[PDB]
Each structure stands twice: as C-alpha cells, then as structure tokens.
Amino acid sequence: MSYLLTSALLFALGVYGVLTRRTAILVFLSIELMLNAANLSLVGFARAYGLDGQVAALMVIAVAAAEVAVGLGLIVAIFRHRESTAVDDLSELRG
Amino acid sequence: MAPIQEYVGTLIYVGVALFIGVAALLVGALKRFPVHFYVVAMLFILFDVEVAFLWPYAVSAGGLGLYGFLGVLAFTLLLFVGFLYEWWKGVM
Amino acid sequence: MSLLEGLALFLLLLSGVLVVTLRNAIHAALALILNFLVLAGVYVALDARFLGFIQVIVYAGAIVVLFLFVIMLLFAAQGEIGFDPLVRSRPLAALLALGVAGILAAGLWGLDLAFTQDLKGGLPQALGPLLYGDWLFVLLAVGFLLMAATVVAVALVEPG
Amino acid sequence: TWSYPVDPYWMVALKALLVVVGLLTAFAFMTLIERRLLARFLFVLAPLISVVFALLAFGLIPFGPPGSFFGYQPWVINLDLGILYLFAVSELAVYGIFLSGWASGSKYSLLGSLRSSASLISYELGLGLALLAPVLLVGSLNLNDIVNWQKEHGWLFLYAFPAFLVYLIASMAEAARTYSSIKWALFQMAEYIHFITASALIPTLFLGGWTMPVLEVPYLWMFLKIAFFLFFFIWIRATWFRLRYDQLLRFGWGFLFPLALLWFLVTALVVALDLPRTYLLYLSALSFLVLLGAVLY
Amino acid sequence: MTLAILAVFSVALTLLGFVLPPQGVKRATLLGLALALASLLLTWGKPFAFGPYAVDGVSQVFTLLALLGALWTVGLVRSGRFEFYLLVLYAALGMHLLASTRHLLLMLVALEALSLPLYALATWRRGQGLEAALKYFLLGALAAAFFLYGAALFYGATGSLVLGAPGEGPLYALALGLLLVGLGFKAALAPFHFWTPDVYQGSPTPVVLFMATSVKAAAFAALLRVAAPPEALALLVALSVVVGNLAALAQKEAKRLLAYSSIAHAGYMALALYTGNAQALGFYLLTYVLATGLAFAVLSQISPDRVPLEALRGLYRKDPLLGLAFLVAMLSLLGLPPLAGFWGKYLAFAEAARAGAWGVLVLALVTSAVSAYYYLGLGLAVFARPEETPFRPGPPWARAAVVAAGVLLLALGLLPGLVLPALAAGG
Ligand SMILES: CCCCCCCCCCCO[C@@H]1O[C@H](CO)[C@@H](O[C@H]2O[C@H](CO)[C@@H](O)[C@H](O)[C@H]2O)[C@H](O)[C@H]1O
C-alpha cells in the first residue's frame, strides 16, 4: 500500500517529465519512468492478488524494450544529420 | 528459496567493495556514427530480454514437458528469425 | 520494514525527481539507472525476486545503455540550450503533474487489501510454469512483437 | 539456499573484506608475473564503478562444504538466483567503461571505449546462452547446487561439452586485446580481477570446482584449478593478442552464440522428454570427437 | 485460424524477402491478407476461443474491415522495400489480436504490435513525414503509458487483467478512465485526437488510408470490450463531434480535413458504445471503411505527400467514375439517404437514444448537419473547372476498386437488409 502511493507519485513525476523536457530523448525517458511506476504498482497488486501481476510486469518490461528499440531508432533516424534534438523544431504540420 | 539474510549480505558486500573502490581512487590521489554501435547495442537489449525469458524455462523445464519445450522452442525461433533478419541485412 | 522502506522510497522519489529535473542527459539517464537499482531492491523486498534481477539486467543494464549510446552518439546535455523556454508552462506542467498525482491518490484511498499472498519470492522456478503455460499465448505474441520491432528498427535506419 | 547455513552479518562483512583484499593482492601478483614474463563527475565516478562491480561477484563462488571456513562459510554470499547475479554485476563494469569513454571528451577515446564496451557486452552475453544448457540439467541457478550436482552426477562439461567450449572460448577471448595515468591502472586492475574471477568460474561451473572425487580437500582444489586457467590467461596476456573485433564479433555471434543456444535446445529437448541424462554424455563425447578430430586434420 | 495465416505469412516473409523480389513479396502479403480474410468468411459464426484469444462476431467483423484496409493499402504501394509490406502484415496481425481479446496485457502487446510498424510507415522520408512519425510516436508512447497504468489499476481494483472482471468502486472507475485514455487516443476521440491531423497530413497517403480505416476499426473493436461508462462516453462524444466538424471547416488541405472528419466520426461511432450494440457499430464501420477507403484511394491517385482541396476539382471530367464514386463517398460520409452511411449513423444514433442520451445525441445531430458544409465542398467540387492538378489515372486495379466499393455503398443504402441481418453473431 505504502508502495502503491509511491508508484502514483512516480507516474506523476514522469508526466511532469514529459511536459517539461525540451528534447525528444528525455521526453521518451520520462515516459520510461512512467512505465516503471506502472510496473511497481503491478508488483504491489500482484502481492495482493497472487503473482500473475509479476508475469504481467515482466511482459511489460519486454514490451517497453521493444518500443525503446523502435523509438530510439526513430529519434536517431530523424535527427542524425539534422541539428539540435529539441522536439519543437518540427512544427510544420499545423491544425 | 533463499533466506532473505543473504540479500542483505549481498548489499553489505557491495558496501565493502565500494568503500575499497573509493580507497583506490584516493590512491589515485597519491555520418554512420550511430548505425553500427546502435544496431549492435539494440540487439544486446533484445538478447537480454530473450534470456530473461529463457531462464524461467531452464529451471522448471522437465516439469513443463514437451509442450513447455515446444513453447520455448517457438519463442526462440521467432526471435532468431529477427536476428537472422538483421544478420542477413548486414551490420556494418 | 518502515526503517529501510522510508529510505528506499525516499530514494526512489528523489531519483525520479532527478531524472525529470537534471539538465544533463547523461546525468539524467544515470540517475534513472540508480532508480532501477533501488527499484530492483524494492522488488526483492516485495517477494518479486526474479523480476528484480531482470530489472537490473534488462532495464538498468541494457535499455538505458542504449539510451546512453544514443545520446552520446548524437549529443547529450548540449541539446538543451536552445532557450525556447515556455516557462509559463513549468508551473502548468507542475500543476498538471500534481493533479495526475492527486487523482491517483484519491482512487487508491480507502483500499483495504490483503497484501498477504504466499507469492514465494518471485523465483523463475515458480514463474516458469505460468509463463510457458497459462501465459504462453501472450509470451509468443510478445516474441512476435520483438521480431516485428527489430525489423522496424532496422528498416527505420538503413542507410544507403 | 535451503540446506545452506547463514553466517552472522559481521562475519559476512569481514569475509567480504578479506575477499576483496585477497583479490587485490592476487591482481598485484598477477601483474608482477606478466611483467617479469615480458623480460568531471564521470571521470572520477566511472573507474569507481568498474572496480566496484568487478570486485562484486567473486563471493558467490563456494570454496568448500559448509562449516569449513573455520566454523563458517567459504563463500561470502550464496543467493538463490546465483547465475543472474554474475550477469548483473558484469554489465555495470562495462557501464563504467563506455562512461569513461564519454568522459575524456576526445573522439576515439569515446569511440574506442564503445568498441571495447560493446565487445565485452557481446561475449559476456554469450556466456549466458552458454550457461543455460547446464542449468537445464542442474535445474537450479545457485552455484552450490551446480557444484554439488557435479559432485554426485559429475563434472558438467561431460554433459554440456559444447556449452563448455563456448564458455571457455568466449571468457578467454575477453582477455584478448583490441589524469590518464591512474585511470588506465584502475581499469586494468578491474579487468584482471574479472579475469581471475573467470579463472575461478570456469572450474566452478563446467568442471567440479573444488569437490574432487579424490582427496576432497576444500580450498586447495579450487585454488589449483584457478591457478590453471589463470596461467592460461596470463599466457594470453603476455604474448599480447589480436582479434580486431570485426572478425571477433562475426565469429562470436555467427558461430559461438547460435551454437550455444542451439545446444541449449538440444539439452532442452532431452530434459523435457526426460529420456536419460546419458544422451548428453554421448552427444558431448561425439561433439568433442568432431570439434577436436577436425582440428587435428 | 486467421491468426495462423497471419503469423505464418509474417514470419515467413521476413526472411523469404531476402530471397524474393519486392514485387513477389507484395504478391505474397496480398495473398496472405486475402487468405486470412477468406478464412474469416468461411468461419463466419464459428466463435473460436483459445487462450486470452477469442474470435467472436466482433473480432470477425472488425478484423474483416481491418484486413480490407490492409489489402487496399498494400495494393497502391509498388515502391520496393519489402519491409514496406512486411510491416503492414505485422500491423495487420497486431490489429487482429487487438480486436480478439479482453486480456488487458495481451491487448497492450497488440497495440504495440500494430502501432510500432505504423510509426515506421509514416516515412515517405519526407521532412513532414518524419515529423508525423515523431509526433505519433511520442504521443503514442505516452498514451501507452496511461493504458498500462490503467491495466495495473484494473488489476488493482480486481484480481484480473481480463475485461469482464466484476469491478469495484473508485479504483475501478479510475482504471477504466486510464484505459479510455489510451484506447481513445488510438481511435482519435477528443481530447486525445491531436496527433490525427498532423499524422494524416504528414504520412504518405496510402499509409494514411491504412490508418484511418483499419486502425480506427480495431480501436473501436477494443472499445466495445471496455465497460465504457455513460459520463466519459458523453464527454468523448461531445468533444470529438464538435472539434471534429468545426475544426474541419477551417481546413484548406484535403487529408487534414479528412482527419478532422475522422475525429467527428469517431464521435458518432462512440454513441453505439452507449448500449455497446456492436451490430450498429459494425455496420457503421462497414460504411465508413468503404467510403473512407474510397476517398483515400482517390486522394492517393492525386498526390501521396499532400493534397490541396483545389486538386479535387475537375475530377469528373478526368475520370467520370472516380468523380461519381468520390461524390457518393462524400454523401455516405455525410449520412444522407439513401446511402449506407446514413444507415450507420442512424444505427448509432438509435443506440444513443435507446440508451436515453438525448442532449448528447441532439448535439451530435446539429453538428452533423454542420458537417454538410465540407462533405459537399468535396463531392460537388468534383464537377468544378479543373485547376492544373496532378493525376495518375490508375490501373484497372484501383478504378474497379473505387468503383465497386463505391457501388456497394448505395447498394447497402437501398438494401441494408442484405448485410445487417448478420453483422451479429453470424446467423
Ligand atoms: C509468430 C506470431 C505470433 C502470434 C501469437 C501466437 C501464439 C499461439 C500460442 C498459443 C499457446 O498459448 C496458450 O494456449 C492455451 C490454450 O489455447 C492456454 O490455456 C488456457 O486456455 C484453455 C482453453 O480455454 C483453458 O483450458 C486453460 O485452462 C487455459 O489455461 C494458455 O493460456 C495459453 O497461454
């Protein structure tokens, strides 16, 4: 229980990260922290409901990895020759 | 399985090791750039995952029988289709 | 319990605060590895042991290593310089973060749960039969996801 | 770690200290041997890490049956999840490597550090795919269970010979080659420490580390096996060695790592179908016959 | 099994494409998609439940439509990089999985399965395409995070990660909201819709076709599985409808206007969720995938990178049947009788009113009447005097495609008593 609240606080912290971070990689990082908050909550509740939540959290980790591969791949691809990685440098597409 | 004491012991061990590290330090007081090194880093972060799944099988394996083995086989073959791809694609 | 727990969770929240605060990408990521270490600690303390070791090995060991290789292979900590600040946003980001915190705290209040399960320290000996068993479909699907993921990532780079 | 006793924390800490200083003096001796044979925040922090996590995880390695460290325990820490701990501590020294690379601020300081970092990671990872196969047989991740399994059923390299080959070959190829005055000293120290650690690990896993059929003396046996593989390591060090890493990665993956996990599935099929354990004695014998007899051409 | 066909073809084609010419791989992916689809048609009314995997009416219809989107999108993309078909197969299977389970975590895996290769498909390597991929990816990953935390809170408030679990008080609600965030984002419902215009305008056009049809389809299939509460449902609806049409007014570019149109349309579709009828939603999405698919095929035959509305004008003279089919599409997307789109809209509205959501319903109807501004501004624009406009007058493939799929529309406008009898359990 004491942990669950820390999980929520962490997720919030990650949200703050995403909203605050100026560069792509670091926004992505803040997202990773959020994911981890979720994982911790999954562990606590697994400890309440019996272990399926651990397998869950592990699958979650795997998934996270996959999207890290693709996401960093994208970040590198788009910004390789291009200059500074600040994500607001791409504002061409306007509503 | 293991008594919880030995994780604490692990941590203590870490403490000693770190302190000694600090000690030795104080005796010190006495284009294409990403591609390769990215691809072969990403594949690390994938094989770590693979193995992270293979370990739970390797322990409870004979208990899981031919269907368990079949599962681990399928899994392995999928991921190796991936690796075989980025191998046949080439990495340099 | 609370003796270690206080220090552990404080260190957790502190670490997260750092990873979202530090202006050095290397330093940030690094702080996140500290986070993952402590997190694997907490997992161990939460009878999820194998998950903890995978937490060090995959998440701390491997993933943020890829992050580091990437921020080092472009440029880290010198990317944030630009000064298109939007500092009217910082208290709004902070406020919205506090809101997304408050809502979760609210939803978690009044929860009386039996956190007493026999979940015999997250060992892979007990994890396995579930994984290659009731979880085998999700496992295999995940495998496929990894394959497709690598094909994407490679095709997402592919110079020439 | 049920059936295996627990020492008071003071003793664990003291034993740990002893092990660290012993590893250090061992390293000192080693360097002296090879030399008589040849006759800002991160800059500081990085080698600290590489030394810390190198020193870590020599402790799991059991030096004798319980009670035999004068009433106590030959090991430092025992751990149910034995083999994952090793992996975990091994990643982080490498962390230290590439980090120190970034620290310098020079091209190729970084780049090179990334080359060695990546390669060490590669082969270190290869060791895991190697170790799956014999874990299948033991059915435990704990090193004491592994060792004692070699006491009863006998020396794992007899059952997992291919895995033994890739383990030995890889862990040995690690030894091969590719202000700043102290930095290199600290790093090399960490590296050698890792080397003697491997020189202990190879016997502990695939052979019967300590735990001989005959004489059954606790320490001296492990010390001798260690001295053997360590000798081979120093021989690798003194002559220098070149692999240059384009061919080392290719060889590593393209041969060793597929082979390691292909063998894993073979022993997996065997354990799942329960057949005997004999089929792996036979297989390892045969694979040895090929992978030796085709060398002697 | 459809899943079997998809898996087989994907894994096989991955390595086979090294030994096959890109074109041959296109033939492959086409055949595979077609076979999956055929396997679906042959088991209509089978319900096949395996593990967390479950093929019922919903999975059947929605993966039928999704596979149709995959089929059409593959048709148009001769450009040789075998992955630019492979990834479509990957995505396709993923969307199937997404539509085929109540298991939250497998659902997440399916979401990544379909949305990861799409981040890649947003790359015609155009500078704007890269922007699209980046936005889609970041916002996507954040949404993912929310959906995951929602799953963890669902497993919080109940012992399961399966939807259909009884459900508590507050924590259960918070869980459903946190799920609706990610799922809603994936279906372009407000206020989770921001990515849609930039991504549709930025991505290569056939890819956008694939998205606006298949993705939305699977997304809604997965939304049927959620117990979506009346309040949240109302919010999502009202916002999506209003923002959809009203913002759609200001659009001077075709693709982006169609994105906003898709936001409003998601808004209308959500009404079916009020009862969660799924017979209504199925029909609606049949008409929608048909007409939208058509519209985007036509918009493909003009320009892949981007299309200004002026380009649409004079289309009739150039090709009479593409002009007519495009007009028909615009009218069916308007929801004007006697076209199938009107029946879909009616069938969703029907569930809204049946549920007793009157204010929401009316609002939707008012702004739907507003939407007649821009749907006509295209369909009519078909007959205007041609500005100098790019036009590659298509193969028999695409012409017969747009024409047939178009005819289907008013065919079901006159006779919805053809397909509607069984978009249900299959009887
Ligand atoms: C390469 C492409 C990859 C795509 C994914 C393909 C995956 C297919 C593999 C299916 C094996 O996965 C596994 O199947 C069986 C039966 O279906 C499941 O078993 C479960 O379902 C059955 C049937 O309702 C129940 O009797 C049983 O109590 C339950 O445990 C198990 O939970 C699942 O985890």
UniProtKB/Swiss-Prot annotation, chain B:
Family recorded in the similarity comment: Belongs to the complex I subunit 3 family.
UniProt-listed PANTHER family: NADH-QUINONE OXIDOREDUCTASE SUBUNIT A, NADH-UBIQUINONE OXIDOREDUCTASE CHAIN 3
InterPro entries documented for this protein: NAD(P)H_OxRDtase_bac/plastid, NADH_UbQ/plastoQ_OxRdtase_su3, NDAH_ubi_oxred_su3_sf
Source lineage: Bacteria, Thermotogati, Deinococcota, Deinococci, Thermales
Pfam families, sorted: Oxidored_q4 (PF00507)
Gene Ontology MF terms: NADH dehydrogenase (ubiquinone) activity; NADH:ubiquinone reductase (non-electrogenic) activity; quinone binding
Protein name, entry field: NADH-quinone oxidoreductase subunit 7
UniProt EC number: 7.1.1.-
Annotated Gene3D superfamilies: NADH:ubiquinone/plastoquinone oxidoreductase, chain 3
Organism: Thermus thermophilus (strain ATCC 27634 / DSM 579 / HB8)
Catalytic activity: a quinone + NADH + 5 H(+)(in) = a quinol + NAD(+) + 4 H(+)(out)
Keywords noted in UniProt: Cell inner membrane, Cell membrane, Membrane, NAD, Quinone, Translocase, Transmembrane, Transmembrane helix, Transport
Subcellular location: Cell inner membrane
Cellular component aspect of the GO annotation: NADH dehydrogenase complex; plasma membrane
Swiss-Prot record, chain C:
Places the protein is found: Cell inner membrane
EC numbers for this chain: 7.1.1.-
Name this protein carries in UniProt: NADH-quinone oxidoreductase subunit 10
Major enzyme class: translocase
Function: NDH-1 shuttles electrons from NADH, via FMN and iron-sulfur (Fe-S) centers, to quinones in the respiratory chain. The immediate electron acceptor for the enzyme in this species is menaquinone. Couples the redox reaction to proton translocation (for every two electrons transferred, four hydrogen ions are translocated across the cytoplasmic membrane), and thus conserves the redox energy in a proton gradient required for the synthesis of ATP.
Keyword NAD part of the UniProt annotation: yes
Coiled coil ranges: none
UniProt GO cellular component terms: plasma membrane
Keyword flag Membrane: yes
Residues that span the membrane, as ranges: 2-22, 26-46, 56-76, 91-111, 137-157
Family: Belongs to the complex I subunit 6 family.
Gene: nqo10
Record text on subunit structure and interactions: NDH-1 is composed of 15 different subunits, Nqo1 to Nqo15. The complex has a L-shaped structure, with the hydrophobic arm (subunits Nqo7, Nqo8 and Nqo10 to Nqo14) embedded in the membrane and the hydrophilic peripheral arm (subunits Nqo1 to Nqo6, Nqo9 and Nqo15) protruding into the bacterial cytoplasm. The hydrophilic domain contains all the redox centers.
Topology versus the membrane: Multi-pass membrane protein
Gene3D superfamilies: NADH-ubiquinone/plastoquinone oxidoreductase chain 6, subunit NuoJ (1.20.120.1200)
An annotated Gene Ontology molecular function: quinone binding
Reactions it catalyzes: a quinone + NADH + 5 H(+)(in) = a quinol + NAD(+) + 4 H(+)(out)
Curated annotation (Swiss-Prot), chain D:
Topology with respect to the bilayer: Multi-pass membrane protein
Broad class of enzyme this protein falls into: translocase
One GO MF term: quinone binding
Keywords recorded for this protein, A-Z: Cell inner membrane, Cell membrane, Membrane, NAD, Quinone, Translocase, Transmembrane, Transmembrane helix
PROSITE patterns per UniProt: COMPLEX1_ND1_1 (PS00667), COMPLEX1_ND1_2 (PS00668)
Matching Pfam families: NADHdh
One BP annotation, GO: aerobic respiration
GO cellular component: plasma membrane
Family: Belongs to the complex I subunit 1 family.
Quaternary data: NDH-1 is composed of 15 different subunits, Nqo1 to Nqo15. The complex has a L-shaped structure, with the hydrophobic arm (subunits Nqo7, Nqo8 and Nqo10 to Nqo14) embedded in the membrane and the hydrophilic peripheral arm (subunits Nqo1 to Nqo6, Nqo9 and Nqo15) protruding into the bacterial cytoplasm. The hydrophilic domain contains all the redox centers.
Record PANTHER family: NADH DEHYDROGENASE SUBUNIT 1 (PTHR11432), NADH-UBIQUINONE OXIDOREDUCTASE CHAIN 1 (PTHR11432:SF3)
The protein's name in its UniProt record: NADH-quinone oxidoreductase subunit 8
Lineage: Bacteria, Thermotogati, Deinococcota, Deinococci, Thermales
Curated annotation (Swiss-Prot), chain E:
Protein name in the entry: NADH-quinone oxidoreductase subunit 14
Top-level taxonomic group: Bacteria
EC number: 7.1.1.-
MF (Gene Ontology): NADH dehydrogenase (ubiquinone) activity; NADH:ubiquinone reductase (non-electrogenic) activity; quinone binding
Catalysis performed (reactions): a quinone + NADH + 5 H(+)(in) = a quinol + NAD(+) + 4 H(+)(out)
Gene name tied to this protein: nqo14
The organism of origin for this protein: Thermus thermophilus (strain ATCC 27634 / DSM 579 / HB8)
UniProt KW Transcription regulation keyword: no
The UniProt record lists the keyword Cell membrane: yes
